[PDB]
């Protein structure tokens, strides 16, 4: 086959997409996996004052790999708005609504040179970007696999469980994973007792990213 | 028929249930509805200690209407852990699991003598009450309709449809009412604009509570 294609969403902004991403492409990369990261929509920016966006992180990561990509290689739908993409690009950029036709085969082209492309989507699965699609139904246009990031506060049971309600309703192959900061043993005592219970009960268990590193490796290149 | 039920649910913890419950309460009696404010199931209170957790707010509101209410007419299922009712319960209460058959005869006793019985959960949605049973579950075996209550921040759209799924996949009534705070005009800019859209484009349009107390009314009593 060409190379894989793994979709990193969230339970909410800031939950980690950015970090996870980079530390799954880096163990990618140690284990001789070529990995890209790519950020195809991302608001919130302004490149002519920052390099610090999410697809600037990426960039540097990405040079380890190819000295010549840049910053439009990788990101292709950037606004300043700190919205839904869909938000940010009728009041930008209003004759040119996001093609997620393009955005398939460019991320696609990738699987051409790489043995796994990683595609962080922004907002959260049911964001706007167009006005008949959200970030899932970008994902399933890839037909990428899921790999949701959830937060490690109070909360996350609800979010995680809404959001494998509606993933569970759709054809892709997903994992839940959560990322646990540095400090936090709140999480062992509040919310692990219920993710223990769910995972016996569950086919599709959710795990902590930390802890995961080796299997969302293999989740991400299984099969075709 | 008997009084009318309308649940409580919300977006996440703190977005503003027991605040909007009250509002709503308050004004349905000021209509000559007379409405009762019930917590079944309460997390994260002592009290020994604090007399003012949502049952002891909402009996405080109670009162207004019959002296003789007391905090253990109103919420039945109490724990000090700060978690998942089925977690403190467990911890806390290990040979008394939550029993929403009970709490569906004691709710529904409510309907003899109120117009409207006003039933706020905990925690959200897909938050356990039992191993088998959620809060959506207890909701659905109440017969209720359901107003849902969001948060006014950046990810309230994602919060919002990913509730908007779980519900209109159930069988129930439902309407989702954002909490609009006090000095919260970036509502307005970033995230009413999709709102709008989603509101042309849905049968069942999120509306703002502070906008909607008759619609909201109007909702919870109509028909059967
Ligand atoms: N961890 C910290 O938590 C903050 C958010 O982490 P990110 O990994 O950037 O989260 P994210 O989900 O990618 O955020 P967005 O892409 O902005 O939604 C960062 O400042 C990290 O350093
Ligand atoms: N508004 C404020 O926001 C805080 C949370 O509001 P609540 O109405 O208590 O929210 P809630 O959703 O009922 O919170 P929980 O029942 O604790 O989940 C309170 O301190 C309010 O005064
Ligand atoms: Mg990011
Ligand atoms: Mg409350």
Same mark, same amino acid.
Do not use: W
């Given at each position: ?15 980690? !997409? ?5 530390? *799954? ?12 990261? *790519? !950020? ?12 610090? @966006? ?7 990561? %990405? ?8 910053? !439009? ?12 993409? *869909? ?43 167009? *006005? ?10 890839? !037909? ?13 049971? %609800?979010?995680?469980? +809404? ?19 540095? %400090? %936090? ?30 299997? +969302? ?6 099969? @075709?």
């Amino acid at each position: 086959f060409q190379g894989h294609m793994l979709f990193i969403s969230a339970t909410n902004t800031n939950a980690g !997409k950015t970090t996870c991403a980079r530390l *799954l492409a880096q163990y990618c990369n140690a284990c001789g996996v070529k990995t890209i990261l *790519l !950020k195809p929509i991302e608001t919130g920016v302004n490149d002519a004052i920052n390099h610090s @966006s999410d697809a600037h992180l990426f960039l540097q990561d %990405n040079r380890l790999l190819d000295r010549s990509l840049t910053l !439009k290689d990788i990101s292709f739908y950037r606004y300043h708005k700190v919205s839904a993409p *869909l938000i940010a690009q009728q009041e930008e950029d209003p004759n040119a609504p996001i093609d997620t036709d393009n955005l398939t085969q460019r991320l696609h082209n990738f699987t051409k040179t790489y043995d796994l492309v990683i595609v962080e989507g922004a907002g959260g699965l049911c964001v706007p970007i167009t *006005l008949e699609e959200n970030m899932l139904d970008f994902a399933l246009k890839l !037909k990428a696999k899921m790999l949701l990031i959830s937060h490690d506060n109070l909360g996350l049971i %609800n979010d995680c469980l +809404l959001n494998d309600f509606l993933l569970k309703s759709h054809q892709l192959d997903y994992k839940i994973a959560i990322n646990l900061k540095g %400090n %936090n043993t709140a999480f062992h005592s509040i919310s692990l007792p219920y993710i223990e219970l769910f995972n016996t009960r569950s086919n599709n268990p959710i795990v902590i990213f930390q802890q995961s590193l080796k299997v +969302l490796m293999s989740f991400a290149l299984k099969g @075709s």
